Amino acid sequence: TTEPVKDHRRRRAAAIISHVEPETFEDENDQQLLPNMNATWVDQRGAWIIHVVIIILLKLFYNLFPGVTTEWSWTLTNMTYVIGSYVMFHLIKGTPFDFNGGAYDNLTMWEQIDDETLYTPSRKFLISVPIALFLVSTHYAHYDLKLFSWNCFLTTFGAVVPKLPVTHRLRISIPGITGRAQIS
Amino acid sequence: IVTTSSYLWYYFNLVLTQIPGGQFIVSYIKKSHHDDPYRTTVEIGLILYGIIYYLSKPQQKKSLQAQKPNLSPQEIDALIEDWEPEPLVDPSATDEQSWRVAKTPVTMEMPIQNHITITRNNLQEKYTNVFNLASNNFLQLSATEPVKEVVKTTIKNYGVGACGPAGFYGNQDVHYTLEYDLAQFFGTQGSVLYGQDFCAAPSVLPAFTKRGDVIVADDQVSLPVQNALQLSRSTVYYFNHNDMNSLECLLNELTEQEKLEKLPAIPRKFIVTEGIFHNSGDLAPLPELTKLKNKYKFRLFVDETFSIGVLGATGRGLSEHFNMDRATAIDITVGSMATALGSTGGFVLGDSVMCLHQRIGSNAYCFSACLPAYTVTSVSKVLKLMDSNNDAVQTLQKLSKSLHDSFASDDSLRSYVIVTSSPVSAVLHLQLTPAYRSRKFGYTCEQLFETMSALQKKSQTNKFIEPYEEEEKFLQSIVDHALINYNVLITRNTIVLKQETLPIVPSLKICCNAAMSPEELKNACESVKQSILACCQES
Amino acid sequence: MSTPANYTRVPLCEPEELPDDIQKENEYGTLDSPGHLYQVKSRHGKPLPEPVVDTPPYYISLLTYLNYLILIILGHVHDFLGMTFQKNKHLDLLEHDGLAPWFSNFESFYVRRIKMRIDDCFSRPTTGVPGRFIRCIDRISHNINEYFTYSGAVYPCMNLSSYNYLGFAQSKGQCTDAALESVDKYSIQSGGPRAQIGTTDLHIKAEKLVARFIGKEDALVFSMGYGTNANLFNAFLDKKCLVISDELNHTSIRTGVRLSGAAVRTFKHGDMVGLEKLIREQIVLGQPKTNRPWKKILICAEGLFSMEGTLCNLPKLVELKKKYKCYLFIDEAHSIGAMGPTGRGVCEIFGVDPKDVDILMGTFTKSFGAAGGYIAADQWIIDRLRLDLTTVSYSESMPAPVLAQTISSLQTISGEICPGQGTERLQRIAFNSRYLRLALQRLGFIVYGVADSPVIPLLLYCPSKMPAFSRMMLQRRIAVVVVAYPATPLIESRVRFCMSASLTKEDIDYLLRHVSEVGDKLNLKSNSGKSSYDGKRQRWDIEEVIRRTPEDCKDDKYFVN
Amino acid sequence: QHKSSMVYIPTTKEAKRRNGKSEGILNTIEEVVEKLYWTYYIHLPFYLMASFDSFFLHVFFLTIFSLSF
Amino acid sequence: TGPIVYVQNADGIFFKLAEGKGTNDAVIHLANQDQGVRVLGAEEFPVQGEVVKIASLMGFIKLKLNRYAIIANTVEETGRFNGHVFYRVLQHSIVSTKFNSRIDSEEAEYIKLLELHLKNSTFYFSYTYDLTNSLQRNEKVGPAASWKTADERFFWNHYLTEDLRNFAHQDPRIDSFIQPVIYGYAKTVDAVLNATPIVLGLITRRSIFRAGTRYFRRGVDKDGNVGNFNETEQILLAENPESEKIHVFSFLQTRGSVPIYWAEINNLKYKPNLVLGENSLDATKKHFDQQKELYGDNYLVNLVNQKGHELPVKEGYESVVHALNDPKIHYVYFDFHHECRKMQWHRVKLLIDHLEKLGLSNEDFFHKVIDSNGNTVEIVNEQHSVVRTNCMDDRTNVVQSVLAQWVLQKEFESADVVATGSTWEDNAPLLTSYQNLWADNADAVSVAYSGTGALKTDFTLGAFNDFLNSASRYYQNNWTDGPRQDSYDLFLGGFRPHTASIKSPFPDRRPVYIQLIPMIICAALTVLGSIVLALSTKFMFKNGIQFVNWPKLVDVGFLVVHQTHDKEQQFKGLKYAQSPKFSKP
């Protein structure tokens, strides 16, 4: 087998649980050369109230329907917010525009926020919002066992667990439905 | 089975004490939801984790450099004051390589043509009415009267230079007309213009190649292609110079491995080469490359600069010489206008989608100003003149063949120099035989390549090699003897050794154009042969 | 002519024949009164006070966020449905017969979905010499900004988008005469690389003149600024060095540093405390994976930033490089001839000795009207770089007419060939910039600058306000340039005004009236108390501004920044 | 020093004054309607959308306003 | 020239000459990787594949993306003359290298246009005899048949065989692959008059420099070509037992249109509007010079309808023929509107009335005496004059048949078959065959030119089909004449989609409120099962020009297109307007 002079090879995982490998000198320089634009807008002016405004608007819109009860309005707005947040933060891996030769082709947006530094104020606010939403929704709207269990499941497994530091830089590769995930 | 429960019980007890007040909250939550343990357990867990996360401290990432938290400020001051930098550029070897600056000829108050007057070494020595054999213009079509009149009219109408980038307002109608003319002349759907030819190849290849792609390149190519490969950031393989068996074997291996890997999305692949090489001056075989790219599903990139205006019956490029169609044979073509057409700039030829993507994703096109109008208009006029008549190409081909036949049929030079060029090339290249070089200077090409690679890898500041400098001095001595004893000017290959990556050795070159007469060329050839024999004779 | 609208081709336009006086008035207007000139004074070595920025109310930013979210959602939905169901229309984005496509759809998302909808506002063909009146080609956009159809009709418009600060873009003058004489004597062809053949006395004369003008010891002249920046850095840098650069540098500098291979670190724009902390940490830490001292440390800076229109704190940088034993490199292309009491550049406005900086860069295309670039430094550095560089030995050389144009413009500004022309142009451009900035601030808008920078950015925030404004300016025969999210932060969008030295005062009055009307219609004026020296909100009538601004812009107390 | 080759476009105020359409009885209503329409139109992202989507967005906004009224 | 055998395979298609010598014969390969045509040796023919026989190969055509081969599968015999055999193409096919793939809508539209043209066409050809010429041109050239000596004017498949010609510049082996065809009619029938065998033939050819579809192409262009130009010949052969010589006769006639500038703009009405252009002197002079050089003298017969609608062109044509003042050009006028129930004795009255101007001699024809071996021993008389008919703004066919029948009596007299002073019209079946031949020729030319057929006399009543024909033609003229002209232009080579400047012409581009009128009319009609419907009908018929289906590939002279837009320079729609050069009479 011939060995290339210069190699930049994307390698896939070979196990169910894996951790994305660290970076090299060239990749570190390419990442540090230019300030990222996907993760910069989080800290700008007016980027924290917008979540509260979105939640209030969604609640008011879902309350407008005639036949919907209060419990289902709260459940629908919780569904919408959690699904939107998950799809925006934890599903798409990469950069919409062209960065320095695909240097960020293995990290999501949450791992890109604040240059991978942990326990920053933005992360604190973003992890604090869903818990307050869940608590207010449960307290103001009387639920049943079935709806309460489902809401707890949704909030726990869709909003909080991906934010935990233990799951940072983690990939799950099911040999069935899920395809093999790039590891380097 | 039991360690998990024990650790779960142990964990929250510590953070209960860590929080300034935790027992009151737990008691209140337990009392409020005393009926059901599920709700109070969920609330306690969520609130406690939120609070404990809020109260932590920032933690950076683990980088290559190691932290040093055990240093006192006095030590910090000591290390900061102890640091010693290096000079910006080392001046130790400046005087040794200075002669190559003092040997550069300077034209005085005349256009560059066949007969010029030069001065060297800061007006210390002056030679008049010399015969020029170092120019790089082959057709000399830009010195005629009609092109001069067109240039004067364009300058009177439009001005000297443009004042904007192509993005906002720097693009005019003459540029569009030139693009249309090039696309029609060379038989391709689209073309794109670039301000400088040296910055064309490094700017287009990185646009279409990303990490995880495969590129197969020739054994020896010019420096701009090497820079493009370096900026490409993709896997790069090398195959032997003009050896199709090795190329076929390499493609077979790559295809088999890729098929066995079972990859979801197929990557992008390329084959990078050129026409008449800049350093060797030989021709590349097109039909075999076309057959291989059609068989193994590869694309083709050709960086032809010395073959646009010299090859073919009319001068349409490398494709015309082999009697093929450019639209399907070659995928990406890179050209230049300074060599044969007689004006500055460069161009890239291909289909419509590639041009549409280059107009947005190419750095050298988006972030630079447009070309002046007169160069564009003169190039278009030259293209029309070339389309009308084709006597210049025939004359150039005959002169080049006659020049090559003279230096490759003699017997008195067989033991000293060898010719590595091609009969169709307009430039003739001469090198020293390995036996004579080994006998005289005591080194070979492989040792020089190994030494330079070792120095480049070790990142040593001073890169100075003695035998290479001696050989360059010897070739300069030959050139100076030829210029002093006879009124003939020839040049050697000017390269920078510390920037090259592929093997290379010093050589000598002779140029030609279509405005000469056979008698002068024959006399110049005889004089050059006599000077070479007189200077290089043993003992 | 019965074929439908499906023919797209830019038509070559014949020139218009006019008397000499009308053409000269078209290209360069004459002075109204001797009182419309201002003379700029030196700072005598004082650091720049911290800049003051202004903000709009919250609801504008909230609406911006909502608009961007809606647009992104719609784009993704359209892309998904189209790619999933209608395969035939999108054949250019699919794998055909075992070959991968040229590009992927994810990377080209913003170009296809957001920018394309406004694609008619960016690229506009023109004709004729670009002066204070520029002729534009009439066109109609078919489909939705997909292709255009031209009817071959032209009209003039006042231009505010051309890089000619001192107005040397002329067709009847001494520079054009010199260029024509050069074409008569020298041809338009170049021999080849400057190392083997292609060096004449003109190149040497130009190098000596540039070296004398800038104030350094020796200089070199190239044929392209972008190539100069790209190929300069690898000549004296390696893997053991460090480059600390601003975060708002040009693309060419980043390309050069990427090609060199050195380690890269960046610091926040306008922060000196962060720069000092970064330097102190980097010196101590050392090289990666081995922890050895760095070989050398270089700092890269820009004289004036075009988008922001703010200067760089030079005395502090000189102090830091002198204290910590670092090297400094300065790129100045927007302030080489348009700034300073005489026009030398940043080193003159701050009173800093030119010997303190190590390498100075610049291009001739911004102000002198000719393409090119130069590098200025000491003697031994240039002696080493003349041999170590790759552009000198492998690339082409610069033609004769451009060189003659550059030499003539430099001699005109230096005050040799023409007696009293350079000072008049410098004073004209200074006064024009001050007048426009003060009038726009008094009307109620928001602008950035340093009170003399030729570039004036006016801020628009909502995504839907940037197209219409531009189109309206085309209806009033004014040309403008706007920038958007991929280049500037998400919240802030802006339109750039590039004032020239050929415009007069009455043109500025006409511009002010039309801009005030359009901004009033579109609800664009939103100021505060931080954009005034008194500290109170101001919303002035147009007549009062036009009547009292010209006599008050010459004072230095009315400018907050 | 008083001739050029440009054509000047007069502002809308001077055009209205020349046409003699400064009577207030209908101009007040016209100005109110135009100002309300532009205030509604500019702040929403209608210039970047397509006709098919803009129709549905208009219908949705009209329905919300009418129902809340 | 003979049957071909082709083999389809994953690497392309190979064509070989089925009947030959078995020596080294060229094999034509259509490449699959780059879509090219190449010539190879005999050994490269695939072995394991299946061979398919085809009667003849027409050519290759290059569309926007791929390249296609047009093939004629089977043929049918029509007439046999002097041993030669005439054939008619029955089945057609289009072959592409790719087995299956994705193609854009434009490619599908182009394929549909090609299929539409191939469906409504009738081609004729012969392996040995050359039909693109007449007996004069055949006699002036050697007795061999080749594409080099063919007439470029009736060489219908010219643009399709270009590649097959490029290799054949110096390549005799390729000569056997090129096959000229004609777009017209050809038939021959045999009979016995008085114990002597005779064969009567008829051939009709059509030019290629103009197009058809009636209203779209009329008058002349700058180059002098005339729309609807066709040629007719009525060859005859006779054998006499009482002697040895074999007799061959020939007669020629030409048809065209008035050479003045004029046009008929179509709208939503039964009768369109007539417009006349500017002065025409150069084009008419060049056209008449070409006609004089080719055929010799000319005799212009101008039949016209009633004055009311077709008057203006008559005065212009008389004025131009007077202004030319050419001794070799002679004008004879005739006018009938009084014919009743297809009674045509005034045709004989006119024939008596004719012959007085310049004396059409019955001697003026082509006479040939040929032996049993067919060596063309000796010629007798040659033809030097023709009659040019430009009528019907039916009639031309009736005039031509009568003139040919009148000449045929002298033709029989010169062959010593029947004694002088005897009429040959006595036999019923012979004249029945004659009439059945000319009626079929008339039907063929009428269906080829404009829509359905025309009024037919046959032997020896039919107002129902006659009326239905008018309604069908009225519908076809106003709603289904775009694609026909587009197919003509695409096949003949007028439009070549090989440039990036030209965008797709198929999508509709007229404004929306013009498009919505028919839907509103249909909705009102189906909810009516009245003021809205009346208003919509009035609006539709008040702007007919905007609703007529127009050709798109190649422009027409008498129209202009305006592009409307809003204040922000954005496209809204296009409108059709009458060209300013043409004017109302």
Ligand SMILES: CCCCCCCCCCCCCCCCCCCCCCCCCC(=O)N[C@@H](CO)[C@H](O)[C@H](O)CCCCCCCCCCCCCC
């Ligand atoms: C019936 C039962 C319930 C059904 C529940 C499902 C309903 C529909 C679910 C919708 C899921 C998808 C919606 C979220 C998609 C978000 C965007 C997709 C693409 C992500 C990558 C884009 C890259 C651009 C980078 C960038 O800087 N973008 C930024 C600007 O350009 C970014 O776009 C802006 O800041 C937007 C500011 C948003 C502020 C907070 C939003 C969080 C709440 C989301 C709830 C969704 C509600 C839907 C109505």
Ligand SMILES: CC(C)[C@@H](C)/C=C\[C@@H](C)[C@H]1CC[C@H]2C3=CC=C4C[C@@H](O)CC[C@]4(C)[C@H]3CC[C@]12C
């Ligand atoms: C009750 C449920 C819903 C959830 C939210 C409760 C607690 C979670 C967050 C707890 C359960 C176990 C915890 C845990 C176990 C072990 C360790 C290792 C230690 O070195 C760092 C903290 C860390 C990583 C923590 C983090 C927080 C975890 C993951």
Ligand SMILES: *Cc1c(COP(=O)(O)O)cnc(C)c1O
């Ligand atoms: C405008 C700009 C350039 C342009 O360089 P050219 O080679 O003249 O096109 C270079 N550098 C900077 C900083 C610029 O702003």
